[PDB]
Amino acid sequence: LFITEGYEVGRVNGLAVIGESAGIVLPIIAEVTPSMEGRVIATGRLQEIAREAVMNVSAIIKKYTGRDISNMDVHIQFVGTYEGVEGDSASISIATAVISAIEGIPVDQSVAMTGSLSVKGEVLPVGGVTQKIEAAIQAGLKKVIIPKDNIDDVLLDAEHEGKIEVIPVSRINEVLEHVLEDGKKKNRLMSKFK
Amino acid sequence: KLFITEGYEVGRVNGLAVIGESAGIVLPIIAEVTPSMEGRVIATGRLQEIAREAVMNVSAIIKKYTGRDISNMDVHIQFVGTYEGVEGDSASISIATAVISAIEGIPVDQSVAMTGSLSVKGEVLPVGGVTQKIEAAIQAGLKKVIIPKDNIDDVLLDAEHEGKIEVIPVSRINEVLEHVLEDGKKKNRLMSKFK
Amino acid sequence: KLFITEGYEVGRVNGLAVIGESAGIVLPIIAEVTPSMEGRVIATGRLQEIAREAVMNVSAIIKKYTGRDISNMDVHIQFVGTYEGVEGDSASISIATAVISAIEGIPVDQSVAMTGSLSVKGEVLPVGGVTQKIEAAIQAGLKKVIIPKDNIDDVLLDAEHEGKIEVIPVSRINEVLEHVLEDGKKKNRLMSKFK
Amino acid sequence: KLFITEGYEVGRVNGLAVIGESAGIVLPIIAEVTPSMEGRVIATGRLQEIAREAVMNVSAIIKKYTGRDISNMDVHIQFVGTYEGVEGDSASISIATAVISAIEGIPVDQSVAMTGSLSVKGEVLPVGGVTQKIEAAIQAGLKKVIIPKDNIDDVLLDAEHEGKIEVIPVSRINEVLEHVLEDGKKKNRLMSKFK
Amino acid sequence: KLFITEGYEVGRVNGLAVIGESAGIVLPIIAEVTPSMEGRVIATGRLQEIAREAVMNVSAIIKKYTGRDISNMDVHIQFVGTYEGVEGDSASISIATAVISAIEGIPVDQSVAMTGSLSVKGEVLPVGGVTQKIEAAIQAGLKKVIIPKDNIDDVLLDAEHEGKIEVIPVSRINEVLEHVLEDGKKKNRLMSKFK
Amino acid sequence: KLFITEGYEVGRVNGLAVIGESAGIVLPIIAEVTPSMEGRVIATGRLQEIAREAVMNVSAIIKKYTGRDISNMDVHIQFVGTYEGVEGDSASISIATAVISAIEGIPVDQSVAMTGSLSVKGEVLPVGGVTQKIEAAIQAGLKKVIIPKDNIDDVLLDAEHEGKIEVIPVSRINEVLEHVLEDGKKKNRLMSKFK
């Protein structure tokens, strides 16, 4: 259902929790088209989660970089079906995808990410961080971005630490920097974070 | 039976879905289009949101490669039967194929089932429940199954069942159409626009 | 009984549904048509999106074959009986037939129940729960039941019920009108327009 | 006391309903209509969706035999009291009558209770709990009860009871109005329209 | 505690409601009005529909007798505290009275609870749970309770609880205002407009 | 932790609320404002109606007391943590204070929790569940809790929560700002606009 290597525009490997206690990799795609009032189009089990996240991150989608979300239709899918899955609020993976789709700048697939984006651009802690890292290990992901406030919640058993890089972050700019493909477009998007 | 297994029908596609979390089912779709006097997508019952998302995604690809603007049409969609407990796929490709077929007036092969999510770029994204879908295709007496290329490694069929069906991987909606649309001048013509 | 089982009535049709999992019901539909003072379909309850769907599709058929365009008109569709847990047939032909009866002023045979979904081109598509629908029409004292032709292989009628009702398989909405509309000069005016 | 037992009031009707399992109760409704200023139906509480469905159904006849399009009015309906565990009639005749009463400015006889479903064609259709409902109307000192013609045989007025109330069977909405609207020129001309 | 028992406040009324099947509770309301800039009714929580309905019904009476147009104002209603499992009264008078209070800038007596439904004509309609609301009033140290005139016969108060509260039957909204609005020039002025 | 107990942070306030049966929670609110690049309040989930209500009431007091207009800006309000069962308070003062903070760029003491409803005139109104909220402030290691002063006699602390936290009763929004805004030029400049 997800790619572990390479870069893809508008595609991010999020992490979620399947029922009571395993993590799963939650791949999302986002695309954006002119509104032609702009809607968020999402379907399935996690559709209200997606629409909510895009609504929360809308000022940072404009009030840093460029476009008003009310002038686009934003098309989101989770790749697969995830009954019994709880996704993060204001999930950073959905934000990154949408910013990735808009900028047309590809996202590294080998890096998984979990976190809640505040409306001020902070990355807030989330549950299930150990379960989620473990799922990223079992999937072959190289790195996992997590909330800095979750650093202490990671309780991996010797062997597993070492199997993946855990990158803790505070700010949405740190997430983009770590996952957006290098190049002039990124260098320019990156300078706009002030 | 709720589906047709042979021959060609305009605007009709054999889809695949999962019921419970165990069993596949064939999901027949019909798409019909009429001029609007702006357009609307009419579908009812539990999978209508999958209908609307697929039309939204195929509209974009239809206008980009052909010029046809389906904001000028009312798009009429039914799942043939009723599908409770049935979970379809996001932007389902069988729905999108049915619409292209109705719009271009080219018949679709009923012996080929297909499962896939359609991205607005026209890529065929992978889906869940692949083996359970292909099995339900086999039971239905279907000859071939179109699946996303990314699902090739999820196909877990007994020897004997590999045998009974053709599994055709695709990654783009024009491969789906090449595979299902009836041969002819109209098809030849459509296929060169999508290049 | 809120619901009738003999006679001819304008704009009333005995439909069939499946309640919860399996038990079938007779589900009467009352339609009434009034020059809009453009126009719209007024229905309530869970089955409203179905009635607007059937109405849309019957309107396209009526326009084409009769020249009569029902968009200057208010179509009130009502379901008799307080049911819950009922999933309806898409574009249900019961509703489509109640509306043709209501528009044309040509009464409908109350001893006939039907089931089926109507395509915009006027084909009667197969539907779920056909065996249960028929056992419910048997249950209810009804003399004939119209089902889609493609549902023939799904009538699992046994050694009790193989005898109780005339099952009438149909392909198209004109065959429904032929078997339910009251004979006379208006029916004949109308039926030669679908010919 | 929630209802009035004698005299005439505009827009006020004593309906009948069943509270929980067994028992009938009187369900007083008031309707009032104001200029829309698109017209809405405003009701609150337990029975608010049954109130809205019923005005929406009915608008057919509220329009169609007589006065005004309800899309040009806001219709404000209350049940006088709180009705926990109450199931009212679908397409309630009392609600229809209250509404026509409030638009026409013709007061309704409060000593006449009523129960039944209005068809979109104007027919009065049978309802459940008729003995129970009658017996609540007797306990309340009401003089007459209008019921559906098809419920005539569901009236089991024991020894006791016969004699305490008049049961008036009706087939049609115009009959309901005739029996409860106050005599005068306004009634006389409203009744000629209902023909 | 959630309400005030003494003295006078602009825009604040002590209403009465029922919790669960029986118990009574004091239901304090505050209404505040601002210029619109057309107007809306802002109310949140479990009781908001009763707030909207009450304002709708008092708007017409406000403009009727007073000229002020509620169309021109945002009406901000809160129920002071949280009222899970509470059923208020339809078009509740306590809400209407708060709005009139807020709009006129004349304080309401907080020692006087009230219950009642407001009709658009300005009649006070009976309500359920009158013994229990009054008990709730007594238990709060409320001095007087205004109830609808048709509920006189539902006051089932034993000697010792009589004597503890004054019960005041009303049938029109101007009687409410006369009873709870602070004496003075403004009130004299207002009471005269309601004639 | 799904809240923070120390620091000063702009636009972030520890609210308090109550879930299911009796338990309380810390419910942090984050606010973000930007000139409307008219403005909108953007909030998500079940408590969104409260947020826009809180916003509207603080709007009126900001515009009237400091000539600012929340109308020229987009206000994002967000609730931290994931909750079924949660009831908010109407016009909740934690949302209002996060807003004033975001707009004036003045940091909020993170060691303080607050509960309270805001009126359009800027009064702080009493609220449900005051004791359970204070204890959810205790569990969270918070030092101060701001309550409505009319809730003073609702504080029923037991032997293991008596003397654990500083309870501050307030009547007006500026007392709130006095107890939570970080001291300096901007806070002083703002506080005299309100005094």
Looking at residue A182, its amino acid is D
Is A21 catalytic? The answer is no
- Listed in order, strand segments (DSSP E) in C84-174 are 86-87, 108-109, 112-114, 117-118, 124-125, 144-148, 166-170
In whole angstroms, give the CA distance from residue C127 to residue B80: 7
Dihedral pair phi/psi, residue E8, rounded to 5°: -130, 140
CA atoms of E61 and E55, how far apart (whole Å): 10
Return d(Cα F94, Cα F116) in angstroms, integer: 8
Beta bridge partners of C30: C12, C78
Query: How many Å separate Cα D31 from the centre of its chain?
Result: 11
* Coil vs helix vs strand at F132: helix
Please name the residue that has the structure tokens 């409803």: F117
Beta strands D73-79 and D23-35 are antiparallel
Residue type, A49: I
**Strands (E) located in chain A:** 7-8, 11-18, 22-34, 40-41, 72-78, 85-86, 107-108, 111-113, 116-117, 123-124, 143-147, 165-169
Distances in whole angstroms, Cα of residue D190 to Cα of each of D117, D153, E137: 21, 31, 48
Where do the H-state alpha helices sit in B67-172? 93-104, 130-139
Angle at CA of residue F96, ends F93 and F97, nearest 5°: 85
Q: Is the dihedral of CA B62, B67, B71, B75 positive or negative?
A: negative
Neighbouring subunits of A (3+ Cβ pairs under 8 A) = B, F
Q: Report the alpha-carbon distance of residue B71 to residue A73 in Å, rounded.
A: 15
Q: Smallest Cα–Cα separation from E104: which of E8, E7, E187, E34?
A: E187
Breaks (C–N over 2.5 Å) after residues, chain B = 37
Residue E11, by phi and psi: left (phi above 0), alpha (psi -120 to 50) or beta? Answer: left
Q: β-pairing, D166-170 with D144-148?
A: parallel
Distance of CA A108 to the CA centre of its chain: 11
> Contact A117/A57 with Cβ under 8 angstroms?
yes
Pair of tokens at residue D55: 């005005």
Residue type, F148: P
Cβ contact, residue pair E80, F117, below 8 Å: yes
Q: Whats the size of chain F, residue-wise?
A: 195
List the Cα angle E93/E94/E96 in 5-degree steps.
60
- Give Dmax over CA atoms of chain F in angstroms: 53
Q: What angle do CA D119, D121, D127 make, to 5 degrees?
A: 20
What is the distance between the alpha carbons of residues E173 and E91, in angstroms, rounded to a whole number?
12
Backbone φ, ψ for residue F41 (5° rounding):
-100, 130
Catalytic residue set of E: 90, 133
Kindly list the distances between the CA atom of residue D7 and the CA atoms of D4, D59, D167, D195, in Å, as whole numbers in the listed order: 8, 27, 19, 27
Element (H, E) at E96: helix E93-104
For D64, the closest of C34, C44, C77 (CB atoms) is C34
- Per-residue tokens: D52: 């809205």
* Closest in D63, D119, D126 to C34, CB measured: D63
CB C96 within 8 A of CB C194: no
Record: contact A29-B119, CB cut-off 8 A: yes
- For residue A70, the tally of other CB atoms under 10 A from its CB is 14
DSSP type of residue D141:
T
Active site positions of C, annotated:
90, 133
The boundaries of the domain holding residue D32 are 1-195
* Minimum Cα–Cα distance from A153: chain F residue: F1
For E19, other C-beta atoms within 10 Å of its C-beta total 17
User: What is the rounded CA–CA span in Å between residue D125 and residue D120?
Assistant: 10
Rounded alpha-carbon distances, angstroms, from residue E185 to B192, C101, E97, E104, E189: 86, 68, 18, 12, 6
Chain F residues with beta carbon closer than 8 angstroms to that of A125: 1-2
Residue type, A138: Q
Contacts of A116 (CB under 8 A, 6+ apart): A88, A89, A90, A91, A92, A123, A124, A125, A126, A147, F80
CA distance C110 to C180: 8
DSSP E strand boundaries for D38-127: 41-42, 73-79, 86-87, 107-109, 112-114, 117-118, 124-125
Instruction: Give the residue numbers of D marked as catalytic.
Output: 90, 133
Question: Is the CB of residue A137 less than 8 Å from the CB of residue A160?
Answer: yes
* Type of residue numbered F115: T
Phi, psi of B131 (to 5 degrees): -60, -45
Question: Around Cβ D8, how many Cβ atoms within 10 Å?
Answer: 17
Q: How was this structure determined?
A: X-ray
This structure's resolution (Å) is 2.0
Beta bridge partners of residue F92, listed in sequence order: F117
F96: exposed, middle or buried (Cβ count in 10 Å: 0-12, 13-18, 19+): buried
Is residue D142 a contact partner of residue D14, using CB atoms and an 8 Å limit? yes
| Beta carbons within 8 Å of B194's beta carbon, 6+ residues apart | B65, B174, B177
CB contact under 8 A, F80 and A149: no
The candidate with the shortest Cα–Cα distance to F100, out of F193, F10, F195, is: F10
Tokens of D101: 């009463």
CB atoms within 10 A of CB A24: 23
State the smallest CA–CA distance between residue B181 and chain C in angstroms.
Answer: 21
Distance CA(E37)–CA(E71), nearest Å, equals 10
As a whole number of angstroms, the distance between CA D114 and CA B166 comes to: 67
Q: How far is Cα C99 from Cα C58, in angstroms, rounded to an integer? A: 8
Cα dihedral: E4, E9, E12, E16 (round 10): 40
Of F12, F34, F80, the CB nearest to A59: F34
F interface test, pick of E12, E30, E41 with most F CB neighbours within 10 Å: E30
Contact: A43, B56; criterion CB under 8 Å: no
> Beta strands of chain D (E only): which ranges?
8-10, 12-19, 23-35, 41-42, 73-79, 86-87, 107-109, 112-114, 117-118, 124-125, 144-148, 166-170
Tell me whether residue E79 is exposed, middle or buried, using C-beta atoms within 10 angstroms of its C-beta: 0 to 12, 13 to 18, 19 or more.
buried
Instruction: Report the largest interatomic distance among the alpha carbons of chain B, rounded to a whole angstrom.
Output: 54
Cβ within 8 Å, pair B45-C117:
no
Q: How far apart are CA A12 and CA A2, in angstroms?
A: 9
Provide the CATH number for the domain around residue A191. Answer: 3.30.230.10
* C-alpha torsion angle, residues A151, A156, A159, A165 (rounded to 10): -30
The β-bridge relationship of strands F166-170 and F144-148 is: parallel
Of A63, A119, A125, the CB nearest to F78: A119
- Of B182, D46, B142, the C-alpha closest to E49 is D46
- In whole angstroms, give the CA distance from residue F179 to residue F172: 11
DSSP-based three-state secondary structure for B43: strand
Closest among F168, F51, F145 to F102, alpha carbons compared: F51
Give how far Cα E18 sits from Cα of B140, B176, E84, Å. Answer: 59, 63, 11
For A65, the token pair is 């970089």
Q: What is the dihedral of CA A148, A153, A155, A159, to 10 degrees?
A: -10
CA distance C138 to C144: 9
Q: List, in sequence order, every residue forming a beta bridge with F144; answer none if it has no partner.
A: F112, F166
The phi and psi torsions of A102 (rounded to 5 degrees) equal -65, -40
Q: Report whether E117 contacts E129 (CB < 8 A).
A: no
Give residue A156's identity as a one-letter amino acid code: L
Residue C6 has a CB neighbour count (10 Å cut-off) of: 10
User: What is the C-alpha separation between B195 and C48, in angstroms, rounded?
Assistant: 43
Mutation target for E interface from F61, F90, F93: give the one with most E CBs within 10 A: F90
Of the candidates F115, F95, F104, the one whose C-alpha atom is nearest the C-alpha of residue F42 is F95
Q: Is C23 helix (H, G, I), strand (E, B) or coil?
A: coil
Is F64 a catalytic site residue?
Answer: no
* Contact criterion met (CB < 8 Å) for D80 and E117: yes
**A184: buried, middle or exposed (CB in 10 Å: 19+, 13-18, 0-12)?**
exposed
Provide CB contacts within 8 A for D118, sequence distance 6+.
Answer: D54, D57, D58, D61, D91, D92, D93, D96, D124, D125, D173
Residue C18's beta-bridge partner residues?
Answer: C24, C87
The total of structural domains in chain F comes to: 1
d(Cα B153, Cα B150) in Å, to the nearest integer? 7
Orientation angle between helical segments A92-103 and A47-56, nearest 10 degrees: 70
| Among the listed residues B33, B114, B14, B115, the one whose alpha carbon sits nearest the alpha carbon of residue B72 | B33
DSSP letters along F7-60, please? SEETTEEEEEEE-SSS-EEEEEEEEEEEE-----EE--STTHHHHHHHHHHHHH
